[PDB]
Amino acid sequence: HWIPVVAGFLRKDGKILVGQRPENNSLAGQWEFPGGKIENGETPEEALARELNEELGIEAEVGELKLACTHSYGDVGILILFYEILYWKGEPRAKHHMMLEWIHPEELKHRNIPEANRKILHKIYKALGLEWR
Amino acid sequence: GHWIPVVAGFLRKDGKILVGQRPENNSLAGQWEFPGGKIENGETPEEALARELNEELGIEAEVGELKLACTHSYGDVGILILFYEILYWKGEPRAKHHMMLEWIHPEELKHRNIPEANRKILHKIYKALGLEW
């Protein structure tokens, strides 16, 4: 079974927004981009819009699709789509994550993050308007 | 709920674009689509598209930029299509799988029998091809 996930890139003077995965639903303590599973019936955009609302409290406008990749966490097959999020109402707050943080993107290189992101960190940096090395 | 990730490519020839007529017995029969297919276990979208284009077109293709993602449910079976721009390949495509192959003016899509999943986003497609609507 494939699990299509959508997730977003939010931005603050070059910084980027990540959330600390909470301790009970686990890839615990790992830093990710906000987003989640697409529900039966919805489009990718609708799903991100919604996930961003329910996770950050923000009312977002979903921008360009930047990236897609696959990963296996065992038998569990996930497909992430990453979207640029230029525009929203309100400021985000930790409705789901342990912490929210605006970090320099460079810092991702030494932050505990999903192997699905770790494996494409270069592709990510590019999609953000930065070079890998 | 349940999902089938598909990868499909945009190949172009002096402005025209390449579609295949779905075979009569493996069916959404008679319908014109962009070549591609289902992603297998362990492969990246790119890997799957390179492979599909080989086994369907006979071409060794280089998979370029990701242009579109969309969802469609054909009743119970849930589909996620990623569309990639295919700029570079070795050889000329031949109908290894499809009933027929054709390079059409993209405008013609408006009056070709195409998957409802593509018809719903024809707007978004024209943009990804660099055209108007």
Ligand SMILES: Nc1nc2c(ncn2[C@@H]2O[C@H](COP(=O)(O)OP(=O)(O)OP(=O)(O)O)[C@@H](O)[C@H]2O)c(=O)[nH]1
């Ligand atoms: N949100 C998010 N998920 C990621 C990322 N990288 C990999 N994933 C995986 O995508 C899957 C689905 O994301 P979730 O946030 O758990 O889905 P959700 O609907 O938002 O929340 P729950 O299903 O209740 O856990 C998880 O297994 C994540 O580990 C990422 O950068 N952001």
Ligand SMILES: Nc1nc2c(ncn2[C@@H]2O[C@H](COP(=O)(O)OP(=O)(O)OP(=O)(O)O)[C@@H](O)[C@H]2O)c(=O)[nH]1
């Ligand atoms: N290839 C392709 N599939 C599309 C398109 N639009 C919707 N689809 C659906 O995507 C699904 C999978 O594509 P297929 O090409 O049939 O899968 P395949 O691996 O290439 O070949 P099969 O195993 O025989 O199905 C089908 O159910 C199509 O209905 C399109 O533009 N191109």
Ligand SMILES: [Mg+2]
């Ligand atoms: Mg969620």
Ligand SMILES: [Mg+2]
């Ligand atoms: Mg989430």
Ligand SMILES: [Mg+2]
């Ligand atoms: Mg959810």
Ligand SMILES: [Mg+2]
């Ligand atoms: Mg095929």
Ligand SMILES: [Mg+2]
């Ligand atoms: Mg096919």
Ligand SMILES: [Mg+2]
């Ligand atoms: Mg196939």
